[PDB]
C-alpha cells in the first residue's frame, strides 16, 4: 500500500532511547512531510468510518504526541476533539487515573464535563507500547459513562501486548513493530 | 458570519487557576467544536499566507498545546510541521534552551536536524503569556541557523508584554485579553 508506505518510510528508529535495548520509533518525519501526515490521517479516518460509520461523537487526543493527531483526525471526520491531559494542566473539576510509566507513577486527567453519559469516543495516540496510557484514558472515559468505541495509533509495539491490555476495547494501528 | 467570533465564543475563562488572581484561557471548547477549530486554523493560515506568501518552509509547534495547532496549520499551508519539545523527550542529537516558567526553570529542545540553515519557520503555540516559551523556541531555531519569520497564537495576554519580549521577531494573535 502506497499511502501506508508514505507513513512507514517516515518512521525513524533510535536504539537505546530513552533506555538501553529498546528502539524508539520517532514519528517526527511523518509530521515534517505533509504527504505522509495527510496519508496517516486519511488511513486512520478511513478505517474508523469503515468500522463505526456515523457512530463516533468525538475523538479524544492523548497528551502530548496524541495532540499531534487528534485535531486533524477529528477534522477529517467532521468531529470535535476532546483532551486527555497529563495531570495538573486542566482547569475546572477533573478526574484522574494513575498508570505505570517507566519506573514510577504518572496520571492522566479529564475535565468532569468533557463528555456526557453515553457519548461515543475514539481515542488516538501516536504509539501503543504497554497500553498503560491508553488504558488510563479508557478508564477516565468510562468514569464519565462515555462509550469507548476504539483506540487507535500510528505505531504498535506488539511484543508489549498493549492490545490485550485494552481488550475488550477494539484497537487498530497503522504500523506494527516487535 | 464572523469566523473570529466562532473562536472567541469558544474560549472558556477560569478565574484563579492555577493561582489566585490569574485567569486561565482554556482553548478546549475550540478543539471540541469542529467549526471553531476550522475557523481558528483558517484565520491563522490566511494571516500567514497574506504576510509571508511563499516564504514559509515549516510550521514549528510547541509542546504541548501548540501541538494541537501546528499540524493542522501546516496541512492548511501545504507545509510540514517540526516539533519543539520539553527537554528529555526527543531522540538523537539535540539543542536545548532554558527559560523561566512559573517560579522555576524549564527547558525546550529540538532535534539538530529538524531544520537546515536558511530554512524559514513560523512558530505556533496556543497562548502567549510572558513570552518565555516562545522566546526559547526562537533561540533554539536561531541556533540551527533557521529564520523565524513570525510567531503566532490563538490567545495573547497583552498586559504581560510577551510581544515586546519577542521583538524584533513579529507576532500575531487571534484574540487579546489583558
Ligand atoms: O503504552 P505506554 O507504555 O503507556 O506508552 C505510550 C505512551 O508513551 C508516550 O507518551 P509519553 O508518556 O512518553 O509522553 P509524550 O506524549 O509527552 O511523549 C506515547 O506518546 C504514548 O502516549
Ligand atoms: O508565554 P509563557 O509565559 O511561556 O506561557 C505560554 C506557555 O505556557 C503554556 O504551556 P505550559 O508551559 O503550561 O505547558 P503545556 O503546553 O503542556 O500546557 C502554553 O501552552 C505556552 O506554551
Ligand atoms: N519505543 C517508543 N517510541 C516512542 N514512544 C514510545 N512510548 C513507549 N515506547 C515508545
Ligand atoms: N493564563 C493562561 N491561560 C492558559 N495558559 C497559560 N499559559 C500561561 N499563562 C496562561
Ligand atoms: Mg504520549
Ligand atoms: Mg505550552
Curated annotation (Swiss-Prot), chains A, B:
Classification via InterPro entries: Ade_phspho_trans, PRibTrfase_dom, PRTase-like, UPRTase/APRTase
Record-listed Phosphoserine modification sites: 2, 13, 28, 64
Top-level taxonomy: Eukaryota, Metazoa, Chordata, Craniata, Vertebrata
Source organism per UniProt: Homo sapiens (Human)
Family membership noted in the UniProt record: Belongs to the purine/pyrimidine phosphoribosyltransferase family.
Listed name of the protein: Adenine phosphoribosyltransferase
The entry's keywords: Acetylation, Cytoplasm, Disease variant, Glycosyltransferase, Phosphoprotein, Purine salvage, Transferase
Modified residues (N6-acetyllysine): 112
Chain positions with Phosphotyrosine modification: 58
Pfam family, one: Pribosyltran
A molecular function (GO) term: adenine phosphoribosyltransferase activity
Catalytic activity: AMP + diphosphate = 5-phospho-alpha-D-ribose 1-diphosphate + adenine
Location of the protein in the cell: Cytoplasm
Quaternary structure, from the entry: Homodimer.
Amino acid at each position: 500500500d502506497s499511502e501506508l508506505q508514505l507513513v512507514e518510510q517516515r518512521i525513524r528508529s533510535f536504539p537505546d532511547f530513552p533506555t538501553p535495548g529498546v528502539v524508539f520509533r520517532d514519528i517526527s518525519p511523518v509530521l515534517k512531510d505533509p504527504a505522509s501526515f495527510r496519508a496517516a490521517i486519511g488511513l486512520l479516518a478511513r478505517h474508523l468510518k469503515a468500522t463505526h460509520g456515523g457512530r463516533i461523537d468525538y475523538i479524544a487526543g492523548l497528551d502530548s504526541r496524541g495532540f499531534l493527531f487528534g485535531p486533524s483526525l477529528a477534522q477529517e471526520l467532521g468531529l470535535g476533539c476532546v483532551l486527555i491531559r497529563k495531570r495538573g494542566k486542566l482547569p475546572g473539576p477533573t478526574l484522574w487515573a494513575s498508570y505505570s510509566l517507566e519506573y514510577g507513577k504518572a496520571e492522566l486527567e479529564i475535565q468532569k464535563d468533557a463528555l456526557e453519559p453515553g457519548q461515543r469516543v475514539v481515542v488516538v495516540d501516536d504509539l501503543l507500547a504497554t497500553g498503560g496510557t491508553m488504558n488510563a484514558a479508557c478508564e477516565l472515559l468510562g468514569r464519565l459513562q462515555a462509550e469507548v468505541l476504539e483506540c487507535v495509533s500510528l505505531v504498535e509495539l506488539t511484543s508489549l501486548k498493549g492490545r490485550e491490555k485494552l481488550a475488550p476495547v477494539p484497537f487498530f494501528s497503522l504500523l506494527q513493530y516487535e
